[PDB]
Swiss-Prot record, chains A, B, C, D, E, F, G, H, I, J, K:
Native source organism of the sequence: Trypanosoma brucei brucei (strain 927/4 GUTat10.1)
EC number: 3.4.25.2
GO molecular function, one term: threonine-type endopeptidase activity
Keyword Protease: yes
Catalytic activity entry: ATP-dependent cleavage of peptide bonds with broad specificity
Annotated protein name in UniProt: ATP-dependent protease subunit HslV
Keywords, sorted A to Z: Hydrolase, Kinetoplast, Mitochondrion, Protease, Threonine protease, Transit peptide
Domain of life: Eukaryota
Compartments it resides in: Mitochondrion matrix, Kinetoplast
Active site positions: 1
Cellular component terms per the entry's GO annotation: ciliary plasm; cytoplasm; HslUV protease complex; kinetoplast; mitochondrial nucleoid; mitochondrion; nuclear lumen; proteasome core complex
Task performed by this protein: Protease subunit of a proteasome-like degradation complex. HslU recognizes protein substrates and unfolds these before guiding them to HslV for hydrolysis. HslV is not believed to degrade folded proteins. The HslVU protease complex functions in mitochondrial DNA replication by regulating DNA helicase PIF2 protein levels.
Subunit structure and binding partners: A double ring-shaped homohexamer of HslV is capped on each side by a ring-shaped HslU homohexamer. The assembly of the HslU/HslV complex (HslVU) is dependent on binding of ATP.
Length: 174, 174, 174, 174, 174, 174, 174, 174, 174, 174, 174
């Protein structure tokens, strides 16, 4: 999996590939969507299985509802619950959550990672490749967010055997 | 085990072999049925032990009854419960669920997989061989769903030491 | 352990050896009974420890009382409970259950196995050897169920270092 | 540890060594008693730690009180409880229980072992040696139960590095 | 693999299945011959890979040539060389060697096994099932060596997921 | 890797993908050739590293030179040397060798596999998928060897994360 | 395996069982001889495979020939060679060597063990049980060496699942 | 850690070192106190982490309060609770408890060890060295309990890389 | 370690970081040079220890001297030797070899990798990050080989905890 | 094993126990001598098997003969050879070598240890306990070397389950 | 072990602790010297056993003799030989070599490490603590090399349980 978010100027984009792999060997599906719109202002991308990721997305929505505008605090409360609840700890997943203002990455180890000033966050077996490529383009004038993200995904997913070339895209502004 | 579903035109078929293997070494039964009719519109096939599979089938029926026409939502709710409930997580099984409209594959990792446009889904040690063979025939005119499935099963079960040459067949239309 | 059941014509027999082994090395007892009569119509044989097997037999009796003549259903319900209850899953055992009509094998993986048309079921470290020998004789006219079983046990228990030459026998008719 | 029981004629004896070993390397105590009198008719010997063994002895007393004369039934009920209760399964011990009439061995795997006609039962790292030696003497002239048990313990505890030469003895008659 | 030899009266037969399995999962070939005629008087059957077995068959021929009529001595000299030579010890195989007079089994652990009075020897993942079934028939009316062997193979190979239903046969007399 | 050979009528084809993967995770090269022409009559395809495969190809040339027309014998001699030579056993690779007449597969376990009557042989992580798909098409109208092979590669390499969509082709006739 | 030697008075006996076991699970032969007469004055018994034991016996004969009357020195020289030679160290076996004067036990760890004053030596999975039983009887007047050894074997082999009830006997005097 | 108690004549001393080690590699503190005075009559020393030891000291105080003068009974009750309670079993620690009359050692395996007639008990990685040295001096002229204990600690802590040279001392009389 | 080579137009650059890490934990040196000029036309960079890498560089120089202009053939011969020679296989390293014309990567698994049309090759724990960043910039205006390489190293070495910010550079033209 | 050397004044003693243990479980001999006189001025004690230790003693004698008075240099040359020779490294043993002047301990890790000013050296599973007890007594006036060594052996061997109470003694003066 | 070298101005010092530890648990010697003067101009310090280190020091002396003034080249040649010679690779050690001009560290992984400008090199379990402390003082005026090293050793050896407080010192000038 490769999930990549790039914020530049007043645009943030979130991209995810569509490959589902079993046994770390075989592609079982090449058209799976790994992004979800949870409301008008918030999108989320996941590495992990459908059930694992959706269970965590539902707990995130509880938190987001309990802390209306404070996305960061919702993420942190989620990560706390995730690490201390016995059932949730048996889940394997990583998330990236975006609003126009904020991007957070949350993983099963309990890290909550916001981007550096370059606006880039990524997860999955391919995420680090994507991040490296996006970082190479972030400051090159005339490359907006979406153009950076597409190029970075092509490069990351060509390298990662666990990600494919078909991508879903979400965009946000303010 | 090989469970294979092929949808082509207005027909979907679901086929399963009949071998039960212990210790990954010995055939303990060669005539076990791995398909179940859960109502007039829905059939299901399983890899895993009788008790493990039936326990998950019963939970699926709860979900199907709680989300009457939405087979996909039932499958997802099942997968969520399966991954988060302590007792169910100690079960090992994979399921394919068919209606005339929809086919879903659900596994213990929490994946819920629908087919590509070719209408093929498969599970078990032999499933991927079956899928490769079915894919080779899917678009060859004059091979209908059942003919594709039978040919694919012969091939997959000849290769997989853990599946045999005796198959059960279910068919659905709309 | 070798537990063997053979049904031929209107007779079914159930035989078990009497060796109890510790550490997979030493005979601690050579005269242990591994068969139980649970009522006039039903006998059961076990591989596993006394306490493990008896705990499961008691649960099987609950299920037999709850599904009076449907011995197959009782066995499946037992297996479901066995796989989903935390305490029972810490037990290790296999069972064969016989009535005049039906024979089932149930194991800790949740398999419930009925015989092929040859009427033969077996469990334990020696069970497969017994089954192979019984299958060789099942169709030879003049060998009734008890004669087949005795011969098969002599052969299986001579090969299996974990089973001995002393056997208990139960018989049923209808 | 070596615990040994020998029944011959109207006498049964129960003997245990006195070595406590830590880390499978060092003698921490050479004078530990491993036998207990639980009433006038019943004695018990243990392999395992003080606390583990005493916790099981107390449960055995519950069962003995619940099945007044039926020492076998009490042992079996104990073994059942031992194998199904989460806390008791974290204990490591083996027991021999004697009355004038009956001797039983109970271990953590859930075996409940009564002796063969020779009247001999034994447990611990040295138990099998003791048993072999006692079996050699059981039928020989001049050797009553206590004389057999002493000789067998000398031989067993000389061979087992985890047992010593100092022994406690209990005797019963009817 | 299942290799089975049965001697009854003045006939000895040697039978082998034809399945080659990779990764303990997939049938790569269903028509491989596992028997070799090494001269007019001597046939040999193998479990293991083509190269491993043929390398050991060649060394066996050296020994057979060096000890003309003494098939047992040749087998022993082979087994000695096999266990002490560094290159040969990296091979994995078992052999059965037949003449009209003698049958020997030789394995990588250095065992050299001649049959009991029943004349039966077998090797491979299915060998013990075959032997059990052949032993059930060895003394029964109407069954010569070949008939016993064919029946025993059907039974053994049905059980062993690593052997198939296609068999080669060699026969010898004197 | 996926290497696939299909013989139908007087044509045999050999196809391979071009992906090189490191650490079972990353594509280091997407344009590597895995087929070699060793003379006018013989082509070979490999799974494994460049150096490992080439070292074995060179030894196979020695054997081909030493057994001019007997490609089967050369392959067997290669496999014997491979299994008994200390340096060669530290190599990991599989090979498929074709002439117009013969196809053989040779692996590190010492198997030498010729095809069934269908003419199909395959190796690599994707080989079995390719074989299943090719077997589905082998007997169907309109499909010559090359058309079968291309279709089977597309299917196999779409499923295997360790093979890509770019293929080299070799063809032979007689 | 159980090999036992008992010296009492002017008689020494050497006994061995006849069971050969594979995979620590199945009896492959019940009539194997584990004793060898190497000359008129010397007998030897072995635990381990035919080839392993015979290879070491042959090296022992070299040493016995190089140190004519000094059986103890030969044994030590053998053990030295066994531990320092690369090929011999890949062998697994234990030996007991008897003359009328001397008994030595030699194992793969390089121990060379002579008996205590009681004249008893034993090896194999059952050896220690045999020793314990022999030691119980060694000083009981009217039990000569052979009577002790037979009784000890019955006991040891009843307990050891890896030894059987059929024994070979050698006797020596001076 | 080295905790050592010596009772000689009417004096008992308890000594402990002061080193705390992390990762079995690094001294994190060289001045940690491992002895506690729990009332005027009772002192206790611990191996294990502050939190683990204190939690078990508190439970010991509960028991000491529930069984006012019976120190041995309190120690046994503690050990029973320790071995059966899920939370307490995840602790690692060993304790020595002293009064003027009694010394007991209690460990996580559930041993409750009282000294031999020499009055010496010890725990920790260094405890057995300390015990050996104290035993050498226990019966020698010119050495009272404290002098023995100091000398034994210097020796033990010089050897044990996990104990240091700084010691706390408690003394009791009656 | 990060070694990165970028060829664009008539310029090829080779860059390496300077960090040496021990135990996968600590920087032992931050100023180590990982590039070597082997003649006027050929530069080489290495991941691995000084001794391992120099021993392989020397063998590469033998090959380069034995195949004067054929860099590719030299690399392949090196990789062959490396994989088949016992001493060289105990070495751990990876190499990138550049001339003005050709770039090759050689690793301990025996892969010999040339770049794609983009001219980029990289090795070490950071190499894949560097490659991803360099691939993002390879086709963009304003960026020559050296500028690409520097930017890619900054990015890769900021991510890789095993690579630092100090780089050596070699340049070649033709 | 416990081997202990104590030098005090003009006397050095070397003591060793006599227990040989197999499988870290059973005493196979209680009267084995572990000391050797190699000439009038030099004695040696060993932990390890007879053959291992004697092989090393013989190499030590080669060195002692090649460096006549320089015991320390002989030991070091032995240890160098032991660590660099392939056959010797497969041996497991530790040695203590004494003359009147010098005591050295040599182990399989290549340590060559001389005593501190207290004159004490020890090896084996019990060695450290012996050392601790000897150190306690070394400076107590009126305890000579032999009295210290005997007391220390009683203590160490009472604690070590792998050493017994029977000791050999060698003494030297100058 | 802690070996530390500090070069400041015209002085270089080399310090080592004196603790020898066995089993990662016990101090076997507290006064072992870990430095050697190999000639007037060159000193060396070692972590590892006596034999391992001395064997490598002797090979270093061969190299130093073969490359008279080029200490660096000698070190590198040593490291090459160390990594490629079968016997030397079975050794475990690390070395620091000093002359007045040069300091090199050489380890079993084949690193050859020269210091940064601060002149500090260190090895052993305590080496990195020593280095850190020496780096804090290196630039503080009035702290010469020997004063820095002593302070750094007190700090590093107080932390490392595997190093002691007793140090050997060598000094060099030019
Ligand atoms: Mg990809
Ligand atoms: Mg099959
Ligand atoms: Mg048996
Ligand atoms: Mg003992
Ligand atoms: Mg089969
Ligand atoms: Mg692919
Ligand atoms: Mg037996
Ligand atoms: Mg210390
Ligand atoms: Mg970095
Ligand atoms: Mg002892
Ligand atoms: Mg220290």
């Amino acid at each position: 999996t490769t999930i990549l978010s790039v914020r530049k100027g007043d645009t943030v984009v979130l991209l995810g590939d569509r490959q589902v792999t079993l046994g770390e060997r075989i592609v079982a599906k090449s058209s799976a969507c790994k992004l979800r719109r949870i409301n008008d202002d918030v999108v989320i991308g996941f590495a992990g299985s459908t059930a694992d990721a959706i269970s965590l997305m539902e707990k995130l929505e509880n938190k987001i509802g309990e802390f209306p505008n404070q996305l960061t605090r919702a993420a942190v409360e989620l990560a706390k619950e995730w690490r201390t609840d016995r059932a949730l700890r048996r889940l394997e997943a990583s998330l990236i959550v975006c609003s126009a203002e904020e991007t957070l990455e949350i993983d099963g180890q309990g890290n909550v990672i916001t981007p550096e000033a370059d606006g880039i966050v990524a997860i999955g077996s391919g995420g680090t490749f994507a991040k490296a490529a996006a970082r190479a383009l972030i400051d090159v004038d005339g490359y907006d967010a979406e153009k950076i993200a597409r190029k970075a995904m092509r490069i990351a997913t060509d390298i990662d055997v666990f990600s494919n070339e078909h991508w879903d895209v979400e965009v946000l502004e303010h």
